[PDB]
Design a protein around this nucleic acid. Structure first.
Lengths: 181, 180
DNA sequence: GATCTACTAGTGATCT
DNA sequence: CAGATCACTAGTAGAT
């Protein structure tokens, strides 16, 4: 079981935010995460693992500030100690940067690249943001490997389509080439 | 190839709106459509088939009017003869109601029940709706059978956890009503 | 291998 | 003036 939320931005584009609070569930989310997912955790303390799912080709640097602060408010509110302390640092890095060494007890994670870890400090607490996110809170029992399988199949199909387009363009090229000779 | 749009509600809940590229891909949409999908088409004219993905458990009568008018604007704008008029009736029914006979031709679809077909009228035309939805447009090449398989697996897991909860519940209940 | 059918793929033109 | 469709020709999978 995984938690799901939605964060709308001023861009008129909505983002999906899924959170496990469970160490085992956090392991399953670490396993099957997508390349478009951004991992959020409170820095020094224990907290739930909060994921922000970016659109395709969207870059971590392009995350709108309001959705970022939504994820940071979410992971701060779900930090056991963090929901008390009023200035807290939230570390977030792309799921592609999460490194699981076998020395890691279940549910704890490392990083491939220290440069790719970003940090954002949340001051105090905002009840309005948490209310808005709670309106969109829904529970799910997904098959993570299957859903990522669907994602990868879509990427494969898009690449194949791109290849077909290229071959069509090349055939039209050669056609105009012979028609100019 | 399938087009995907996002319609935000006034409560700031997002809805997915998908529309096929051609009528054959739309046959693919008809085949693998989800039980949460609501099918949209222009009434008695020729148009695109625009689908709305409802939240799990949401009912066709629960649709917010803004999302409904977004979908209806989307079929109207994509209709050959429909984008040119000022009043266009749009029929919509749950995907579960769609019936496809081998007699039917590509782009045509029937209904198991006439009582489940609904109508909503689009008056005039709005460019702000169309452009707003256009900024969320994205092209995808999904595997629809695998995606509906994922949805059904989620439903299965949900029902399993449910009947597990009932099993533990009636267990503890039998213990209490036994020893008390 | 020798026919044969039954399908898919490719291509140029012609129609919207 | 891009895409759908027609009218072919040519290639491939089985099957006898």
């Amino acid at each position: 079981m995984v938690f799901y939320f939605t964060s709308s931005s001023v861009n008129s584009s909505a983002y999906t935010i899924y959170m496990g609070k469970d160490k085992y569930e956090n392991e399953d989310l670490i396993k099957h995460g997508w390349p478009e997912d951004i991992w959020f955790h409170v820095d020094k303390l224990s907290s739930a693992h909060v994921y922000l799912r970016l659109h395709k080709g969207e870059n971590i640097e392009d995350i709108p500030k309001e959705v970022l602060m939504d994820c940071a408010h979410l992971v701060k509110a779900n930090s056991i100690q963090g929901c008390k302390m009023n200035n807290v640092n939230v570390v977030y890095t792309p799921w592609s940067n999460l490194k699981k060494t076998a020395d890691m007890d279940v549910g704890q994670i490392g990083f491939h690249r220290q440069k790719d870890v970003k940090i954002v400090t949340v001051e105090k607490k905002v009840n309005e943001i948490l209310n808005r996110l709670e309106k969109t809170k829904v529970e799910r029992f997904p098959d993570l490997a299957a859903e990522k399988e669907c994602r990868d199949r879509e990427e494969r199909n898009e690449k194949k389509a791109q290849i077909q387009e290229m071959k069509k363009r090349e055939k039209e090229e050669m056609k105009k080439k012979r028609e100019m000779d």
